[PDB]
């Protein structure tokens, strides 16, 4: 059950350029990055643009607002700095920059640090000083995942980078998970008990293979806030000498699926018939915001819309 609630495109733009989104600290408002590097604040129910800020001179790929509403992480496509940490309290300004990290996340338990990714390397920064506290990389244990993204575990004491499990306290890799795909490097389950690496669900304690989930192949995942449902969407295949107009054009395919977060069995498969750019839910798990591209290969540009659905 994903009942439509609202839909809206970018205001005053023949070619709507929404690329990513996250609910803001203020209820009813959604943050959306754009293909021109802007961060915009919209009313998700009326579709009215409330604010717009310049963040990068290239398209925003991903963003994350801190839980307390004071900070925002952004990542761009081809700009300097590549990622940034912005202040949202009162005035909107840049607190810090992460020059060549193509992707950044907040720490999860206490959000006082940022973890960014550059190729096979992870960088851990202090939010206040902006200093790089750690550089995690081991050429012996490296996997070279093409879409590697470093991430903290729920209690911030462990890190996952390139499929390698690192102990933050000692800055020492404790285990390398074998490489069974070319792109996805895996994430932590919110329960802190297992790791989800593409189609392999590993137990953290014993490193046993808990689940084979073929449907998660090449998928990015996000959980509801009670840790009971997992949304997964398959990345867009990069092919090789594929037709132009088909090269990139969208990060995901046109479908996403829901999984029981405990037994990983399928719940629902939704094919919106439009390439997906991003999706998120609110803190109370009431709504699902999805960026969907309408148009055609005829178009030299995206024409995305944001759709809000009711979480059944």
């Amino acid at each position: 059950a994903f009942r439509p609630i609202s839909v809206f495109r970018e205001a005053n733009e023949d070619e709507s350029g929404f690329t990513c989104c996250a609910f803001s600290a203020r209820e009813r408002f959604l943050m959306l990055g754009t293909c021109t590097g802007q961060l915009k604040l919209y009313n998700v129910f009326s579709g009215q643009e409330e604010a717009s800020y310049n963040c990068h001179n290239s398209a925003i790929t991903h963003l994350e607002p801190s839980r307390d509403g004071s900070l925002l992480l952004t990542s761009a496509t081809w700009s300097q700095p590549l990622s940034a940490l912005w202040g949202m309290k009162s005035v909107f300004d840049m607190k810090h920059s992460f020059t060549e990290d193509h992707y950044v996340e907040f720490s999860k338990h206490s959000q006082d640090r940022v973890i960014g990714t550059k190729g096979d390397i992870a960088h851990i920064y202090d939010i206040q000083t902006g200093n790089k506290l750690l550089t995690l990389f081991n050429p012996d244990l490296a996997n070279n995942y093409k879409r590697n993204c470093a991430t903290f575990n729920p209690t911030d004491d462990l890190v996952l980078n390139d499929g390698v499990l690192w102990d933050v306290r000692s800055a020492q890799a404790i285990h390398k998970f074998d490489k069974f795909n070319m792109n996805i490097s895996g994430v932590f389950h919110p329960n802190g008990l297992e790791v989800i690496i593409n189609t392999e669900i590993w137990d953290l304690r014993t490193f046993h293979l808990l689940h084979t989930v073929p449907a998660l192949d090449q998928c990015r995942v996000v959980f509801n806030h009670t840790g009971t449902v997992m949304y997964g969407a398959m990345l867009q295949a990069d092919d090789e000498d594929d037709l132009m107009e088909e090269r990139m054009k969208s990060p995901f395919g046109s479908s996403f699926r829901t999984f029981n977060a405990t037994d990983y069995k399928p719940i629902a498969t939704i094919d919106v018939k439009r390439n997906i750019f991003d999706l998120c839910t609110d803190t109370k798990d009431c709504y699902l915001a999805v960026i969907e591209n309408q148009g055609s290969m005829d178009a030299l540009n995206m024409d995305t819309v944001c759709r809000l659905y009711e979480v059944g």
Binding site: T36, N57, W78, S79, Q80, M244
Partner: protein
């Protein structure tokens, strides 16, 4: 009196751009210098004193290239927003927005008559546009990788294109047919090309620290210029003709290199920039070189040679 070696010295440093400066172009009448930046802005300066004249705005992403019309009245810009734009320099208004490329537009130029514009793009195509109407006249499937530079010859009958596919291609403007394909033993990415003033040679930079003067009709490499550093960025290069025959280029060691065209010996290395020098330009009548540098620099410098 043509000197044995030039003697360029720094006279002005132009600041204002807030991001890497991508290109500097002297207007054909010698009055002005146009600069494009990753900050999405064009800026017009006095060619001799570097006095800031104006800012020209409109693009939504960084700008790679800018080019003057022959009468110094118009400017064409190629931007990462997939468009080119034709601008009235005096008013600073965008007269036309050329849409057609499916990805970043990297290079642009007017033909000598300035009724046509040629563009190259990350989408691997070359496009010929009608300046008056802004409509695309021709789309050439020019290469199998991003197009790094496009240039008309002296009379506008030929276009030359360079690409990361390692090839240079000579095209007939009127028919759109590829008349020649210059290939080398190895095919390193070709990061820049332009016709020589006489139109019989092409100067091509490859991302192996090398500039090469080619007789394209015969496909023979006549001259090679080295000593600089160029492995990453598509650095513009110039024929200097006002006070001796020089080849001028930026460098990834932050220096401006000047070689004796005939002998290939380095005759000067201008120091001052604090980052990669990605663009240089030679004044049309005076011994003036404009150079532009990237993110850690953001400035334009004017060098003058009394020799």
């Amino acid at each position: 009196p043509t000197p044995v070696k030039p003697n360029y010295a720094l006279k002005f440093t132009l600041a204002g751009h807030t991001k890497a400066v991508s290109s500097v172009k002297f207007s054909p009448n010698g009055e002005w210098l146009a600069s494009s930046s990753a900050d999405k802005l064009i800026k017009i300066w006095g060619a001799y004193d570097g006095k800031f004249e104006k800012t020209i705005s409109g693009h939504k992403l960084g700008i790679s290239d800018v080019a003057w019309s022959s009468d110094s009245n118009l400017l064409v810009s190629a931007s990462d927003d997939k468009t080119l734009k034709i601008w009235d320099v005096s008013s600073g208004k965008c007269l036309k927005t050329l849409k057609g490329h499916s990805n970043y537009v990297f290079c642009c130029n007017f033909n000598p008559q300035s009724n046509l514009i040629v563009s190259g793009s990350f989408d691997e195509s070359v496009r010929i546009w009608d300046v008056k109407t802004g409509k695309c006249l021709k789309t050439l499937p020019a290469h199998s990788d991003p197009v790094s530079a496009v240039h008309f010859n002296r009379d506008g009958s030929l276009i030359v294109s360079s690409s990361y596919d390692g090839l240079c291609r000579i095209w007939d403007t009127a028919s759109g047919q590829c008349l020649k394909t210059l290939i080398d033993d190895d095919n390193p990415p070709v990061s820049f090309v332009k016709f020589s003033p006489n139109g019989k040679y092409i100067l091509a930079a490859t991302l192996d620290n090398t500039l090469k003067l080619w007789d394209y009709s015969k496909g023979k490499c006549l001259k090679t210029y080295t000593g600089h550093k160029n492995e990453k960025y598509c650095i513009f290069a110039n024929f200097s003709v006002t006070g001796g025959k020089w080849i001028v280029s930026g460098s990834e060691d932050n220096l401006v290199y000047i070689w004796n065209l005939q002998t290939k010996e380095i005759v000067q290395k201008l120091q001052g920039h604090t980052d990669v020098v990605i663009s240089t330009a030679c004044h049309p009548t005076e011994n003036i070189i404009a150079s532009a540098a990237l993110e850690n620099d953001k400035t334009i410098k004017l060098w003058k040679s009394d020799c």
